Amino acid sequence: TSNDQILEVGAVLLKDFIYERVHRHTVVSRHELGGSELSDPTHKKLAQYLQQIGDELDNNVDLQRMLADSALQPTKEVFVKVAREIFSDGKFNWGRVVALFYFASRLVIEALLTKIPDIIRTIINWTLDYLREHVINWIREQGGWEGIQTYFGTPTWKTVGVFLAGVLTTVLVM
Numbered sequence: 001t002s003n004d005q006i007l008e009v010g011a012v013l014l015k016d017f018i019y020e021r022v023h024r025h026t027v028v029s030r031h032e033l034g035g036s037e038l039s040d041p042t043h044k045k046l047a048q049y050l051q052q053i054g055d056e057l058d059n060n061v062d063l064q065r066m067l068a069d070s071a072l073q074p075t076k077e078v079f080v081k082v083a084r085e086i087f088s089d090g091k092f093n094w095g096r097v098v099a100l101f102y103f104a105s106r107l108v109i110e111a112l113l114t115k116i117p118d119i120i121r122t123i124i125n126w127t128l129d130y131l132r133e134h135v136i137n138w139i140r141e142q143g144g145w146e147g148i149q150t151y152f153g154t155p156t157w158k159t160v161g162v163f164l165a166g167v168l169t170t171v172l173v174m
Contacts, residue, residue, distance in 0.1 A: 001143075001144060003136055003137075003140060005144075006136055006139050006140060006144055006145070007128065007131065007132055007136055009043070009144070009145055010128065010131055010139075010145070011034075011035070011124075011128055012035055012036075012038065012043060013043065013046065013047060013050065013101075013145065014101060014104065014124065014127060014128065015030065015033045015034060015035030015124065016030075016035060016037070016038055016043075016047050017047065017050050017051070017054070017101050017105060018033060018104060018105040018108045018124070019033055019035070020047070020051055020054075021051075021054055021102075021105035021106075021108075021109065022105070022108060022109055022112065025109060026109070026112040026113060027112075028108065028112060028117070028120060032117070032120065033108075033120060033121070033124060034121055034124065046145060046148065049148065049149065050098065050101065053098055053102070053152075054102055054105070057102050067106050072106070072110065073110065073114075074107040074108070074110040074111040074114065074116065074119060074123060076126070078107070079104075079107060079123065079126045079127075080126075082103055083100060083103075083126070083127075083130050086099055086100055086103070087100075087130075087134060087135065092135065092138045093151060094142075094147065094148050094151040094152065095151070095152075096135075097131075097135065097139075100127060100130070100131075101127075104123060104124070104126075104127040107123045108120050108123050108124075111123060
């Protein structure tokens, strides 16, 4: 319910997001990442939600083959090139933010794998800084970390309406 609070909530979600991605994948501790385990129910439930999207993405083999490209490295120029490309058209939506989250979590995993744990807070701050400088007025226009399940759910909600209407056509007209 404020720019500072939206980013502070983003930080706690991003940290917990990367922790669980590494956790169910090499170990990194919440304290290493700069976060505490969520206590807020709203945060905990959105965190549980973000995790299911991460699992859907893990099961995209073509995504995984890209992330395994040797060019995918836990480095400033990789982060900046990718972050900018995610958002470059200005048509923001919650899939853009999640894709940045998921991409960040993989840089952290690669920093673990390549034995440079010391950059992990830096990866985190790259990601928070980009949100702070470019994405936070958008999120505020959503009223906070709100609208997430509206955005991912609407397209399939609509197919229910189209399905029911076809049932009714079949049954009331024919």
